Amino acid sequence: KPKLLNKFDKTIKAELDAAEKLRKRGKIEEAVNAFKELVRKYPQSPRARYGKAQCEDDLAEKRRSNEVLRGAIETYQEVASLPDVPADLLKLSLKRRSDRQQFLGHMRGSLLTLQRLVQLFPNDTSLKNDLGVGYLLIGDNDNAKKVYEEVLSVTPNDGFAKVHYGFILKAQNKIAESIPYLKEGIESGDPGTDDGRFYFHLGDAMQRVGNKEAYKWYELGHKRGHFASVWQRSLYNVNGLKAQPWWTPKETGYTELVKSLERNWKLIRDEGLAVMDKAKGLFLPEDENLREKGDWSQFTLWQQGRRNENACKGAPKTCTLLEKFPETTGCRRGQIKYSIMHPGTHVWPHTGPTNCRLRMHLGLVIPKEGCKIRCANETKTWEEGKVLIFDDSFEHEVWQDASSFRLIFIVDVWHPELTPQQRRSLPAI
Ligand SMILES: [Mn+2]
């Protein structure tokens, strides 16, 4: 199918095949000089330069170096600047250039390439789809929307365009309108639609409009390998870790941490309330995307295993207490923080980013009624001086319908089945 040879190229198929085969063999440094010399021999050889680029491209993957890759990105460009270039080759060259530009984070550079391709091939639908992604990657949702509307006006059933259009609509706070576009695009089974991100947004949208069918799509996502289960849907995971929504302190093995929290809870409470009264500005609003309504703030002591020195000066005894338990102060994928929630608050269902942590909640100030938290299929309430433990990689949801504020202390710990070496090796989240 691919037509990569023009008349001038058709006279050197033997030389090219050899040079090409060397790359295929894995002996790359030969293919470089091999193709490099094919330029000096015949400078107007797109396929020769295209080879050199692929060599540099493959050589980049080999050496894990961005510098040589930057070279390839230019060589792919050179291919497109030659007098007579076969269309198929021109498309392959600039597409790979755009892809590698995106890889390095040259998003606007990639966009310019994509804009060039669309100008060269004004009838290729897939290229317009790629142009749309280009706009999305620089945060230009308005131009991306126009692209996919253009596509859909010509190809109404293009699935790739539907899921992206749906995503754009959702981002513009047109939640209900986004759902059918996301549904139809996924059901089309078109290339690029079987992506966990679209299951994520589809399920999220449905839940925010009160459609209980969301879990059917989460389950399907699980079947497609996008989610660990219908409930457990975190992105950054380690395999083999025991997965259950609620834990008892004994099951975690962190019994001494739990005892220390429950026994000195009044102390932890009082330093939190003091910050409220004297430095309320230290309580920052929580995730706006997760808050449907109400007032919900947080005061952080540890973040990604990093102590906040200024914050500990406001709660010196609590920090001193926590220093003794590295399973939480060293948890690079968790936090330690006060969390205050006022009446009329609702937190949308959601999961945390990883399955490598458990989340402890110590009740500090709990109204008599109105406050509750669901994880998976079980709903519970807090108790002053008592610790709850759940795996927040499982879907959880929170309500505050009391007559006074709710204060809790949040303590993340390494998943207990993680080995010391794993706890040392994992990147931070
Ligand atoms: Mn949460």
Side-chain angles (χ1 to χ4, degrees), residues 1-94 96-305 307-367 370-400 402-429:
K1 291 190 179 179
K3 295 165 272 187
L4 313 179
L5 319 178
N6 58 339
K7 293 182 177 180
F8 188 80
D9 239 39
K10 297 177 178 179
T11 72
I12 51 173
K13 198 234 185 184
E15 307 188 45
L16 303 178
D17 288 26
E20 175 56 40
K21 177 158 292 219
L22 294 173
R23 182 174 69 83
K24 301 282 283 183
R25 277 173 173 172
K27 194 180 180 87
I28 292 166
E29 67 176 354
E30 298 285 302
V32 169
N33 287 262
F35 277 113
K36 262 202 128 189
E37 292 224 340
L38 287 172
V39 165
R40 91 189 158 72
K41 212 91 178 187
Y42 300 110
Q44 294 201 331
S45 180
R47 184 63 180 85
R49 290 182 182 270
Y50 180 80
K52 170 169 172 252
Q54 288 199 291
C55 291
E56 292 168 302
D57 194 338
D58 298 342
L59 182 53
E61 283 290 353
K62 176 266 191 67
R63 297 186 177 175
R64 286 285 299 262
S65 75
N66 294 340
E67 179 54 29
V68 307
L69 183 56
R70 163 147 80 234
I73 284 168
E74 173 55 23
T75 307
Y76 282 115
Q77 179 78 343
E78 294 175 7
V79 175
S81 61
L82 303 180
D84 292 334
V85 194
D88 295 332
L89 181 64
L90 178 64
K91 209 178 287 159
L92 274 161
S93 190
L94 295 181
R96 183 60 177 173
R97 181 169 185 271
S98 173
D99 176 84
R100 296 296 83 186
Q101 281 178 304
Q102 289 185 6
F103 176 80
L104 292 174
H106 304 179
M107 301 312 186
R108 193 172 177 281
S110 170
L111 178 61
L112 295 163
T113 305
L114 291 164
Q115 288 174 332
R116 183 186 186 183
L117 270 162
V118 168
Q119 176 178 43
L120 292 166
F121 306 100
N123 296 338
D124 192 326
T125 288
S126 66
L127 286 177
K128 272 165 189 165
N129 277 341
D130 292 326
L131 175 63
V133 172
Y135 279 118
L136 287 171
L137 289 177
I138 64 158
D140 189 349
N141 291 23
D142 279 36
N143 276 320
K145 190 175 175 174
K146 295 173 187 172
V147 168
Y148 292 115
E149 282 173 344
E150 182 180 3
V151 172
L152 289 173
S153 67
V154 183
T155 310
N157 289 323
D158 187 271
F160 186 95
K162 279 192 178 186
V163 292
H164 283 82
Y165 191 66
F167 171 81
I168 293 173
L169 290 174
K170 184 171 174 292
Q172 295 177 343
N173 200 64
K174 286 180 167 167
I175 313 302
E177 293 86 330
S178 76
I179 291 170
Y181 281 102
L182 287 165
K183 280 187 180 175
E184 288 163 5
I186 292 174
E187 286 192 346
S188 82
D190 284 4
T193 60
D194 185 27
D195 186 326
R197 295 177 299 166
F198 299 129
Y199 281 89
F200 173 91
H201 283 297
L202 171 54
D204 185 40
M206 271 180 296
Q207 287 179 305
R208 289 177 189 242
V209 298
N211 189 342
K212 315 307 176 184
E213 180 173 313
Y215 293 106
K216 136 171 167 176
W217 287 93
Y218 284 139
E219 177 59 43
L220 177 58
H222 160 60
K223 254 91 166 192
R224 302 297 299 177
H226 301 308
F227 307 131
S229 66
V230 68
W231 292 115
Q232 198 181 20
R233 314 194 292 271
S234 56
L235 180 58
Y236 303 95
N237 306 311
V238 172
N239 305 135
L241 301 181
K242 183 179 180 184
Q244 62 182 10
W246 294 99
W247 291 63
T248 69
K250 190 176 107 176
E251 291 184 286
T252 70
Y254 299 132
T255 49
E256 289 304 317
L257 172 55
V258 168
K259 284 166 173 181
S260 180
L261 291 168
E262 295 191 344
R263 290 168 181 174
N264 302 272
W265 75 272
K266 286 183 189 292
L267 171 60
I268 295 172
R269 181 195 62 190
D270 292 351
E271 288 194 325
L273 290 170
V275 170
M276 271 176 68
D277 305 343
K278 296 156 65 180
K280 189 159 290 194
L282 291 176
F283 275 85
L284 307 178
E286 267 284 5
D287 199 332
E288 292 295 348
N289 173 245
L290 298 179
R291 182 184 62 82
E292 178 191 7
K293 50 170 176 175
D295 190 334
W296 181 31
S297 305
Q298 135 283 135
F299 170 48
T300 299
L301 303 181
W302 264 268
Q303 174 144 69
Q304 296 179 345
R307 174 172 165 169
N308 189 284
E309 300 301 337
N310 188 82
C312 278
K313 285 183 176 297
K317 297 177 181 303
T318 295
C319 285
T320 295
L321 191 71
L322 290 159
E323 285 293 346
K324 197 209 176 191
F325 302 97
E327 56 267 40
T328 177
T329 58
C331 188
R332 279 179 289 89
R333 292 195 167 181
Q335 308 106 43
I336 308 172
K337 63 196 195 176
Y338 293 93
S339 180
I340 180 161
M341 197 172 292
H342 296 282
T345 301
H346 175 243
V347 183
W348 291 117
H350 69 283
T351 75
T354 183
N355 82 325
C356 293
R357 82 192 186 192
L358 295 180
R359 178 150 284 186
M360 300 191 177
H361 280 185
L362 174 66
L364 302 176
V365 181
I366 309 301
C371 307
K372 58 181 186 176
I373 175 168
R374 175 181 66 76
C375 190
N377 67 323
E378 292 182 56
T379 303
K380 298 181 184 296
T381 57
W382 298 272
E383 273 190 61
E384 297 188 342
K386 298 300 190 181
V387 167
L388 285 175
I389 312 170
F390 67 103
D391 186 345
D392 82 322
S393 67
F394 283 74
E395 186 190 275
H396 53 287
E397 189 180 359
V398 185
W399 299 265
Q400 220 288 37
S403 304
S404 51
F405 71 92
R406 182 231 66 182
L407 181 65
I408 62 172
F409 196 58
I410 301 179
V411 181
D412 289 335
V413 297
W414 285 119
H415 191 288
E417 291 181 358
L418 287 169
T419 65
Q421 177 54 26
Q422 290 176 305
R423 302 179 187 200
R424 244 138 47 196
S425 301
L426 292 166
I429 296 176

